[PDB]
């Protein structure tokens, strides 16, 4: 009697934490733009209270408003898009010091890109601008509002 973690409505609140996360420079799912990424991240639905590790989720079974998430392959590796609605907010975990995204002065929404190997291995990406929180590894906690289906 609970909505599982592999079920997202447009309007849910996602609470991702990133145990110690490294900076990427040229991430291809988000164009050619930088990112912080973690190996052992944890995705949380706030309104339902359902918590799950990112690497323990079959990401082909996750649906947004019933329909399946958008997938892209870049250099032979498959990335999954959970589109947000608004900019993704993130900050160093436990510290009030915050970070800001790549399109930090642009009226665009962000997404939440997930690499998935096929087994028990998955990465989680947050679109960033630079190393405003460090070059990594650094604990990051994110916050986003779940968005519409990509047309």
């Amino acid at each position: 009697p609970a909505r599982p973690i592999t079920n997202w409505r447009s309007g849910d609140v996602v609470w991702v934490t990133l145990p110690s996360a490294e900076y990427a420079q040229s991430q291809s799912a988000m164009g050619s733009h930088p990112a912080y990424w973690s190996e052992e991240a944890t995705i949380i639905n706030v309104a339902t209270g359902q918590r799950a590790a990112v690497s323990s989720i079959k990401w082909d079974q996750v649906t947004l408003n019933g329909k399946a998430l958008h997938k892209e392959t870049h250099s032979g590796l498959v990335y999954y898009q959970l589109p947000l609605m608004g900019k993704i907010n993130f900050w160093q975990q436990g510290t009030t010091k915050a970070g800001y995204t790549y399109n930090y002065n642009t009226t665009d929404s962000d997404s939440l890109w997930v690499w998935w190997d096929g087994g028990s291995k998955a990465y989680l990406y947050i679109s960033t601008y630079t190393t405003m929180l460090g070059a990594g590894p650094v604990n990051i906690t994110g916050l986003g509002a779940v968005g519409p289906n990509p047309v």
């Epitope: 930088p34 190393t131 070059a135």
Partner: antibody
């Protein structure tokens, strides 16, 4: 474990060209970058330049007058460094590091997982 | 250009403070790193992001940053810590990686 193993010591003449290798292991070589630093006898380290193995994008310093050239072999996971026009004061221990970070205005480069160094002597 | 004291010294068991001094384009807007280097060996990372240790670095080593200055603290100095210690940051004015000068540590 991540290791960087360089080439052996070399002895050149004033005006020759020295090529220093840097073998990599223990990590995905196309994920990170490789820099090159030197150490003159009696001084601290001086940065020379790097490369990014994702696409190939070198960025050298100004104190060297366009004499350095950094290339990579993707198949053998090995990065190179060719210094031409060897002046007498180019005698140094040339180090290899794993470049990682950003150079935009809040910047942070780490240079973790160095290599053991290579002495190059430019004399007669 | 990063400036360091050439030598810092303490008794076994005390603490040392190794400090750099850059400018607003070296350290005031960027994150500094501290390295450990025996002569004739490879340098080893100690502090990144001004205050953070990698795995396998003891709690004795701690760093900080205050404005355009940055200080490496080695609390509880023992034998085996006799090498050079030097900074690294990005200079947005020169568009280059600038290093310190290295600091000798002599155990009394």
């Amino acid at each position: 474990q991540v290791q960087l193993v360089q080439s052996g010591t070399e002895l050149k003449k004033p005006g020759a060209s020295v090529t220093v290798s840097c073998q990599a292991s223990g990590y995905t070589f196309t994920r990170y970058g490789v820099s090159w630093m030197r150490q003159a006898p009696g001084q601290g380290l001086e940065w020379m330049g790097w490369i990014s193995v994702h696409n190939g994008h070198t960025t050298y310093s100004q104190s060297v007058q366009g004499r350095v050239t950094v290339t990579t072999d993707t198949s053998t996971n090995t990065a190179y460094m060719t210094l031409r026009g060897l002046r007498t004061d180019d005698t140094a221990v040339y180090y290899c590091a794993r470049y990682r970070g950003s150079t935009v205005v809040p910047a942070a480069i780490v240079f973790d997982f160095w290599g053991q160094g290579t002495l190059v002597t430019v004399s007669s | 250009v990063l400036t360091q004291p050439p030598s810092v010294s303490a008794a076994p068991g005390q603490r040392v403070t190794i400090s750099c001094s850059g400018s607003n384009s070296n350290i005031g807007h960027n994150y500094v790193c501290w390295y450990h280097h025996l002569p004739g060996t490879a340098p080893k990372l100690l502090i990144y992001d001004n205050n953070k240790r990698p795995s396998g670095i003891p709690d004795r080593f701690s760093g900080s940053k205050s404005g355009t200055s940055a200080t490496l603290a080695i609390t509880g100095l023992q034998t085996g810590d006799e090498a050079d210690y030097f900074c690294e940051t990005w200079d947005s004015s020169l568009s280059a990686v600038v290093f310190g000068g290295g600091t000798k540590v002599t155990v009394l």
